[PDB]
Amino acid sequence: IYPTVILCLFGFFSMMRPSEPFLIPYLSGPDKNLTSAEITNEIFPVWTYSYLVLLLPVFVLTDYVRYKPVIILQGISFIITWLLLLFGQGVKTMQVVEFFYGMVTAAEVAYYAYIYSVVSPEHYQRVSGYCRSVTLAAYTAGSVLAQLLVSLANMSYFYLNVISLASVSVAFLFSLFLPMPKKSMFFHAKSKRLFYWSLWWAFATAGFNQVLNYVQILWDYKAPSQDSSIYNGAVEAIATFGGAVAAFAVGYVKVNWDLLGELALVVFSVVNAGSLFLMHYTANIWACYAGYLIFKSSYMLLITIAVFQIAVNLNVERYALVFGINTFIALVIQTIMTVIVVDQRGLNLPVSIQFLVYGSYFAVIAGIFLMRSMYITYSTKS
Numbered sequence: 001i002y003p004t005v006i007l008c009l010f011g012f013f014s015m016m017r018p019s020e021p022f023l024i025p026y027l028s029g030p031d032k033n034l035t036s037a038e039i040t041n042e043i044f045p046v047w048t049y050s051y052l053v054l055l056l057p058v059f060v061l062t063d064y065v066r067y068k069p070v071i072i073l074q075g076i077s078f079i080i081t082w083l084l085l086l087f088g089q090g091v092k093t094m095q096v097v098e099f100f101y102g103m104v105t106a107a108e109v110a111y112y113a114y115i116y117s118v119v120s121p122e123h124y125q126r127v128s129g130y131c132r133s134v135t136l137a138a139y140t141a142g143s144v145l146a147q148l149l150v151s152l153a154n155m156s157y158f159y160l161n162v163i164s165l166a167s168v169s170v171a172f173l174f175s176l177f178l179p180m181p182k183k184s185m186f187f188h189a190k191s192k193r194l195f196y197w198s199l200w201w202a203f204a205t206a207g208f209n210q211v212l213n214y215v216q217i218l219w220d221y222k223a224p225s226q227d228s229s230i231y232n233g234a235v236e237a238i239a240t241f242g243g244a245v246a247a248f249a250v251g252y253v254k255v256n257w258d259l260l261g262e263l264a265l266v267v268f269s270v271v272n273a274g275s276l277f278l279m280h281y282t283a284n285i286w287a288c289y290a291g292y293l294i295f296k297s298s299y300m301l302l303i304t305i306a307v308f309q310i311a312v313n314l315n316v317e318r319y320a321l322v323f324g325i326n327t328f329i330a331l332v333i334q335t336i337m338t339v340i341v342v343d344q345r346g347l348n349l350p351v352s353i354q355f356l357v358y359g360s361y362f363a364v365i366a367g368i369f370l371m372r373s374m375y376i377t378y379s380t381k382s
């Protein structure tokens, strides 16, 4: 009745942010005057470190304090992040906003744990799917709004950032009076083949997060971002719509998975690597846009399948206890690969080269997972 509507409106107004599609074009513009090397190699890598640091503390804080204060914390973190994007000028200030965005992403778990904590035991997946769909629709509508406003009204990215601050303010106001849960999930004390799909999910989502962290900066290299020649809002709206319809198509089609799940996963990883190589090698911005859509759709198929083979035979209380470990492994892998690749203390690689590395990473994951299926040679050779 009431708590679900409050959470739905909070999620919609939090996710609806026209600033995010045009972030690096706004950061690498006259408003901030930040070179691409600075954002690529000093500012953005801080997000992965902040998220990895804050994952587990936020994970236990959500459980301990009954999931509402962490939602208000995410709201005030949104407030601070977008206020400091609106009124911040400096590499250190942008590292701070990256830390606060990592805090936002870490605290996002509360928005979904509160759902299980407050809804009736009769069903959880229905309201969880509605909440996820409302967040996705909010993001898509925000991207389309940003694209339309930029294209028609000639409206600067400062005004879009203002709109995002207003939206997150309304979201925080809505999260102010969420009813309190009366129970926690595992505030008490705490198959082997699941290790396969856990590794699949961890590696694929580490690659996806690291790719998304720098897709826009790659778009910046092909065409002048500070000009109006870019189409980030429409492109990212189409990308998230394609990802959503792709994740739904996996449920629309009901095929056996215990037989060809690994084959589907390796095929999708191969397509991911191909899309990344298309992004890296091409010279046209539209080819990179199409590669982004293809990669997002293929990764969404891959992760929908991987989450199915983890969640079919898992308890609802163990869903969180397993996905927390899986995303911790994913963040460990992403932080290691970022320190080796992106961070200035490592190789200081421009985004014009990072995407070859990402495509090779996906290709190597697919190849090694196929090679682990080495039992083909032993049985066939008799």
Ligand SMILES: Cc1cnc(Nc2ccc(OCCN3CCCC3)cc2)nc1Nc1cccc(S(=O)(=O)NC(C)(C)C)c1
Pocket (backbone or CB within 6 Å): 015, 019, 020, 021, 023, 044, 047, 097, 098, 101, 105, 139, 208, 209, 210, 211, 212, 213, 214, 216
């Ligand atoms: C306003 C702002 C401030 N700091 C950041 N840092 C940042 C940029 C790109 C990132 O890659 C996404 C990695 N994973 C993070 C969550 C899902 C994907 C992660 C962090 N992004 C910002 N906007 C933004 C730009 C491009 C993509 C994203 S997002 O994918 O992470 N946003 C959601 C779709 C998850 C809502 C957000």
